[PDB]
């Protein structure tokens, strides 16, 4: 009847396509779905959940709660960072294992703003001030508190607020960061002042760190790799 | 379902065709493009750019700046042309290597108006008059200044304007000139008067020549040949 011409591309299965397929149970009525609470509509809405960053990946400390706290102490008051942290959400083992990172693993380009958090979880009576600094990419992580105070940085008073939060900003020439290897910036924490305390209270506080995506974050070009 | 008949031509790949093909990344969002300045929309908009004509293709002078100037001198005042030039944009090595020519190379018929230019680039104090003549096709290039003055020709005073421009007109019976071999016309330059000068200023001026297409120019039936 109607004259037609099959062009090239006919009879090839193309995984990456979708066309109305004939259904194998056309009579069968499907069970209606219910309003189960907690429907996810977009992967980003998981990247948006602040999760813990394994700061210590020392064979010993890893694979146990210990890989998540930072032993804020009161030992010789050195001048290096308390914990430096490169913001290559994918190019860094520390950040790689996070949830954010887990979703990033399934994509090649992603580009947004990471927001971090540092919940202090030491004595209620303990008190001090730590300097948290954002070394922007291209540069070098600061090694002295001084250098870091010159840069951007919060001066977070332990005693006043148990948690310093802070959204690092989005940047990239190539307006989509590549997950693979090589920049991204850093985040360090400096003892600004020692963590002074009243009575026998231990001189061993700890700090937890979070990370997540902000609304501006997004990913593109999916790429699963998981195999065996 | 709908009865159909596959006519001849089905299942043949025809390089020269275009049909909506199934896309391999239907989910993938493409990077939006920016307003990069200098977008070209049509090849002609390159043919429209006056470029330099290698007047001398002598093995020696060629493949170096020297293949582009004309040694206007003050030696025995001969009566031949200073530089004759056949306007076969493709059938002539001199004009072949130009940009115009480069685009012409990718087509069989083209048909418009070439506009030439002769920028004199000798002393500011130097002065003279050269006769530039358009011998139309079919005829023979003029060999004496006299014959050329009878034809069409500008009398371009060096001293008054450093550059004689002049659009040669479009002609052809076969209202599309064929790039291959055999007419097209000529363009000669005659010393009209010697190039007189004041003091030790050298008696060696030079002249540059340009060529390009005018709005009426166009090409048709593409034909790439480049191989190895």
């Amino acid at each position: 009847g109607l004259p037609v011409m099959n062009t090239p591309g006919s009879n090839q299965y193309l995984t990456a396509d979708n066309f109305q397929s004939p259904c194998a149970l056309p009579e069968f009525d499907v069970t209606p779905p219910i309003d189960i609470p907690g429907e996810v509509k977009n992967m980003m809405e998981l990247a948006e959940i602040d999760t813990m960053i394994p700061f210590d990946l020392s064979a010993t400390k890893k694979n146990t709660m210990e890989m998540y706290r930072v032993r804020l102490s009161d030992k010789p008051h050195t001048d290096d960072p308390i914990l430096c942290l490169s913001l290559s959400p994918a190019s860094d083992p520390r950040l790689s294992h996070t949830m954010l990172g887990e979703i990033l693993n399934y994509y090649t380009h992603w580009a947004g703003s990471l927001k971090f958090t540092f919940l202090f979880c030491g004595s209620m009576m303990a008190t001090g001030k730590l300097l948290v600094s954002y070394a922007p990419p291209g540069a070098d992580p600061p090694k002295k508190r001084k250098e870091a105070m010159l840069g951007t940085h919060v001066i977070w008073d332990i005693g006043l607020q148990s948690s310093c939060t802070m959204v690092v900003p989005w940047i990239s020439n190539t307006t989509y960061r590549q997950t693979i290897d090589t920049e991204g910036g850093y985040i360090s924490v400096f003892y600004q002042t020692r963590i002074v305390v009243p009575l026998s209270t231990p001189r061993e506080m700890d700090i937890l760190g979070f990370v997540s995506a902000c609304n501006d974050f997004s990913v593109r070009l999916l790429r699963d790799t998981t195999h065996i | 379902g709908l009865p159909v008949m596959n006519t001849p031509g089905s299942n043949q790949y025809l390089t020269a065709d275009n049909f909506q093909s199934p896309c391999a990344l239907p989910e993938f969002d493409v990077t939006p493009p920016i307003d990069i300045p200098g977008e070209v929309k049509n090849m002609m908009e390159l043919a429209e750019i006056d470029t330099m004509i290698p007047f001398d293709l002598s093995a020696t002078k060629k493949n170096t700046m020297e293949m582009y100037r004309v040694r206007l001198s003050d030696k025995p005042h001969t009566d031949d042309p200073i530089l004759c030039l056949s306007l076969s944009p493709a059938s002539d090595p001199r004009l072949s290597h130009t940009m115009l020519g480069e685009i012409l190379n990718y087509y069989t018929h083209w048909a418009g108006s070439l506009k030439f230019t002769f920028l004199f680039c000798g002393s500011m104090m130097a002065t003279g008059k050269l006769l530039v003549s358009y011998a139309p096709p079919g005829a023979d290039p003029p060999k004496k200044r006299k014959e050329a003055m009878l034809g069409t020709h500008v009398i371009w005073d060096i001293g008054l304007q450093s550059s004689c421009t002049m659009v040669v007109p479009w002609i052809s019976n076969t209202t599309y000139r064929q790039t291959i071999d055999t007419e097209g016309g000529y363009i000669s330059v005659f010393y009209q008067t010697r190039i007189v000068v004041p003091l030790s200023t050298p008696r060696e001026m030079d002249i540059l020549g340009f060529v390009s297409a005018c709005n009426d120019f166009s090409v048709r039936l593409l034909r790439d040949t480049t191989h190895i």
Partner: peptide, 7 residues
């Protein structure tokens, strides 16, 4: 930026 590719 858009979220589309990660719905």
């Amino acid at each position: 930026r858009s979220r589309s590719e990660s719905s």
